[PDB]
Amino acid sequence: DVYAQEKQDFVQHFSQIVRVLTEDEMGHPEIGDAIARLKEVLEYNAIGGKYNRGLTVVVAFRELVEPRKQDADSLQRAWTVGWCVELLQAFFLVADDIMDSSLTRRGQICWYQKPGVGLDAINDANLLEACIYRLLKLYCREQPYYLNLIELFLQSSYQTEIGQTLDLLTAPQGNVDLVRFTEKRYKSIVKYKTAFYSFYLPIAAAMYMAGIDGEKEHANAKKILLEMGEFFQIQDDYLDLFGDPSVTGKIGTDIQDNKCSWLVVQCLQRATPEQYQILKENYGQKEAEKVARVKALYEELDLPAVFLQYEEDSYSHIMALIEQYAAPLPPAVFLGLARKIYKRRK
Amino acid sequence: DVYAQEKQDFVQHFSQIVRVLTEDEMGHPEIGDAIARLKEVLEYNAIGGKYNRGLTVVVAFRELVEPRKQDADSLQRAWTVGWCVELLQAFFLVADDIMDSSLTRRGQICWYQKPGVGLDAINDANLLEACIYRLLKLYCREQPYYLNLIELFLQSSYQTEIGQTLDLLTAPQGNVDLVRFTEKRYKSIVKYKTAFYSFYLPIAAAMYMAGIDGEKEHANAKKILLEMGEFFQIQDDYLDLFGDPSVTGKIGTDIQDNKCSWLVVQCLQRATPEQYQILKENYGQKEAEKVARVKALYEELDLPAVFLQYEEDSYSHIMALIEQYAAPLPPAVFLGLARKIYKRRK
Ligand SMILES: CC(C)C1=CC2=CC(=O)[C@H]3C(C)(C)CCC[C@]3(C)C2=C(O)C1=O
Ligand SMILES: CC(C)C1=CC2=CC(=O)[C@H]3C(C)(C)CCC[C@]3(C)C2=C(O)C1=O
Ligand SMILES: O=P(O)(O)C(O)(Cn1ccnc1)P(=O)(O)O
Ligand SMILES: O=P(O)(O)C(O)(Cn1ccnc1)P(=O)(O)O
Ligand SMILES: [Mg+2]
Ligand SMILES: [Mg+2]
Ligand SMILES: [Mg+2]
Ligand SMILES: [Mg+2]
Ligand SMILES: [Mg+2]
Ligand SMILES: [Mg+2]
């Protein structure tokens, strides 16, 4: 609703993002070809998703500043920082697609699987990360929140990299240990790898933009948002296997790449001993034969019904946390973001 | 001399760097394995080189602050920022070794070629980059230069990524165009990919640490240091082919990876037309047979004698630039860094 009306405005602002990033080194014409490559990197990897995270920055911002303080410049900043969050996303996704050996993202081939790119994508990603800070300096250099935003984006990146490290250490290629795949470990992975940057970051960004910068307001926002981000990742794990790749826009890899997916942890909690072994023999391997066997087992234990149950209970809990911890923020802030991830299928 | 006496102190401070980076998330014990991996990432990829860049921060700092203002805390900061520069280096090298398909660095196997790492190295690198800003916040958060340093490290990274993009666009795998490989293009590549982060960054860091933060002092320092960094990269290109991999610590790749090396640009300036074709047919290809042919041609045109000539003339020019542009800084700042790269063989 609030997200859906703002989408178009938000996407239209991308042209200016590109312009500003591609122009103020063109009285450096010697780098001209690099800057053309940047343009192309941005167009391929910032565009095509739902924009929930960047929209969250613009929406929350609208809802937390008095309209008499929403001058045009201030809006311009709000959706720039919006776009900075989308660039962080793009950054991590381009890298994650290489490290997960994935094939599609957003219903096209992964950047690194393009003829002519491959592992050059690595530097492409680092550039996307640099652009965040280019924009902040351009649009927010003279705001009193400038340094708060810089430190927030850096800390959210560190946290997601710590989470990525955990994600990959728990999933060595060619090493089935199923013993690694616990609830403690899962909860911990998803907190760091998804929950800070996809839920805390954008809302916290708009908080500092509206001058709301006390530790306790942030901590309380955080309690809500880390839990929403956990749920979001479990959805992601479910959709990796049971989703339509024409709706998700991406082909699943989690069983192949030996991942601590939510599904495998649930599986392990339910599995008879004979089931344990079918999973042991078939998991973390690239053979389609063997992946299909894992899925059939998951289906055998009604884990799609267990997902649909978990979704229901988690949503109630998130809502309790909003009742508890939203004040003095408008609940609409959290509710609107919850409604936009409830029962999502991309 | 000044570098050589400070090395030991500087290296000894690494233990504390690691300690500080591995401890203040251990009342977050859930990430404990990620933090162990960080430790290991740091030990493998920050240690084993010459430390010229980090030593440059400590040396310049000593030479620009009055001793009565070199309290123990201030030194501690100076070699922390020293180590931040070495981490930026580590960051780029781990990524560069993957994108250049290299085999050895610092006389051991490239991190990504370790059994158990490969392309996980990508996130390993991003973590090294995050640590820079972790340390800055730890040690320099309350200094008036804090934000100058943050912006300098970010801008130097953007610039080196722009340079990397140029480096790889000029060297597509399986596309010999020799026409791309000009002086304009080379000079431009090396400015961005090496010269900002290896020469400007460390000295500029110590300038802002000593309260010397005017545009014109920086611009003048920069004129000297961009030119030293150009020379340094040409050395690097020469050593890639004509150096001892037991002294350099790394096996060359530039002809294989189709690079705009200084040698190939020189070659092209000298080559008869029949020579042009031997180069055309043999360059940018992985066959040892064909690489040897390129080297023999370079040798045929006395390019090691042309290198040794260029080294001589460039050094005179750098020294002229110091005579011109050092003031009011002590010339020792520039001289000491020049002496430590003159006629280097690693
Ligand atoms: C960039 C913005 C549109 C945006 C795009 C998203 C695209 C994706 O492919 C989504 C998944 C693949 C389902 C992974 C989680 C959600 C993703 C990452 C997604 C965003 O969160 C997002 O803000
Ligand atoms: C980390 C610090 C010791 C340091 C190490 C270096 C190690 C290298 O391998 C050097 C080359 C491979 C010759 C590439 C240029 C110089 C290198 C990068 C180098 C440093 O500059 C450096 O500060
Ligand atoms: O499953 P992942 O964590 O790789 C993923 O959700 C991306 N991601 C990466 C870090 N946090 C989320 P995607 O499924 O989009 O590939
Ligand atoms: O030759 P490159 O630029 O790849 C190199 O010098 C590293 N580098 C990367 C950017 N600047 C310098 P190395 O020869 O160490 O591999
Ligand atoms: Mg992943
Ligand atoms: Mg993935
Ligand atoms: Mg997934
Ligand atoms: Mg390179
Ligand atoms: Mg290299
Ligand atoms: Mg080289």
CB within 8 A of A114, min separation 6: which ones? Answer: none
DSSP state of A47: S
For chain B positions 1-60, those within 8 Å of chain A (CB to CB) are 25, 30-31, 33-35, 37-38
CA separation, residue B125 to residues A258, B24, B140 (Å): 22, 20, 23
What contacts A246, CB < 8 A, 6 or more positions away?
A107
Cβ(A59)–Cβ(A51) below 8 Å: no
Exposure on the CB side of residue B315, measured as CA atoms within 13 A: 17
CA–CA separation, B241 vs B237, rounded Å?
7
- Helix, strand, or coil here: A181? coil
Q: What CA–CA distance (Å, rounded) separates A340 from A234?
A: 16
Strand partners, A105: A108
Which residues in chain A have their CB less than 8 angstroms from residue B190's CB?
A: none
Q: How far is CA B275 from CA B50, B264, B300, in A?
A: 38, 12, 10
SS3 sequence of chain B:
CHHHHHHHHHHHCHHHHHHHHHHCCCCCHHHHHHHHHHHHHHHHHCCCCCCHHHHHHHHHHHHHCCHHHCCHHHHHHHHHHHHHHHHHHHHHHHHHHHHCCCCEECCEECHHHCCCCHHHHHHHHHHHHHHHHHHHHHHHCCCCCHHHHHHHHHHHHHHHHHHHHHHHHCCCCCCCCCCCCCHHHHHHHHHHHHHHHHHHHHHHHHHHHCCCCCHHHHHHHHHHHHHHHHHHHHHHHHHHHHCCHHHHCCCCCCCCCCCCCHHHHHHHHHCCHHHHHHHHHHCCCCCHHHHHHHHHHHHHCCHHHHHHHHHHHHHHHHHHHHHHHCCCCCHHHHHHHHHHHCCCCC
CB B4 within 8 A of CB B50: no
Three-point CA angle B158, B164, B169, nearest 5°: 130
Helix (H, G, I), strand (E, B) or coil at A108: strand
Tokens of B83: 């180590």
* DSSP label of A286: -
Report which of A45, A55, A48 is spatially closest to residue A81, judged by C-alpha positions.
A55
Q: Is the dihedral of CA A164, A165, A169, A170 positive or negative?
A: negative
Residue B155 to residue B149: CA distance in whole angstroms: 10
CB B310 within 8 Å of CB B234: yes
Amino acid at position B229, single letter: G
Helix A273-282 / helix A262-270 crossing angle, nearest 10 deg: 150
Tell me whether residues A154 and B147 touch, CB distance under 8 A. no
Buried (b) or exposed (e) across A105-133, using 16+ Cβ within 10 A?
Answer: bbeebbbbbeeebebbbbbbbbbbbbbbb
To the nearest whole Å, the CA of B304 is away from the closest chain A CA by 28
B102 C-alpha to center of ligand 9: Å? 6
- Going by the DSSP 8-state scheme, the letter that residue A189 receives in this structure is H
CATH class of B1-346: mainly alpha
Q: In B, residues 89-108, which contact A (CB 8 Å cutoff)?
A: 95, 98-99
A114 given a catalytic annotation: no
How far apart, in whole angstroms, are the C-alpha atoms of residue B50 and residue B33? 30
CB A193 near ligand 3, within 6 Å? yes
The experimental resolution of this structure, in angstroms, equals: 2.4
Cβ atoms of A229 and A194 closer than 8 Å: yes
The residues, any chain, with a CB within 8 Å of residue A317's CB and separated by 6 or more, are: A227
Q: Which residues contact B64 (CB under 8 A, 6 or more apart)?
A: B206, B207, B210, B212, B329, B330, B333
CB B93 within 8 A of CB B108: no
Cβ distance A6 to A58 under 8 Å?
Answer: yes
Q: Phi and psi at residue B76, in whole multiples of 5°?
A: -55, -50
Tell me how the structure was determined: X-ray
Distance separating alpha carbons of residues B244 and A63, to the nearest angstrom: 64
Q: Which helix (H) or strand (E) holds A104?
A: strand A104-105
Question: Distance (Å) from the C-alpha of residue A2 to the closest C-alpha of chain B?
Answer: 35
- B268-276 — which CB contacts under 8 Å span 24+ positions? B268/B178, B268/B181, B270/B301, B270/B303, B271/B297, B271/B301, B275/B301, B276/B178
User: Which segments of chain A does DSSP mark as H helices, in order?
Assistant: 2-12, 14-23, 32-45, 52-64, 72-99, 121-140, 146-169, 183-190, 201-209, 215-242, 245-248, 262-270, 273-282, 288-300, 303-325, 331-341
Distances (CA, A) of B62 to A25, B9, B79: 35, 13, 11
What is the Cα–Cα distance from A40 to A124, expressed in whole angstroms? 10
- For residue A261, give both structure tokens: 């997916």
| Residues whose CB is less than 8 angstroms from the CB of residue A289 and which lie 6 or more positions away in sequence, other chains included | none
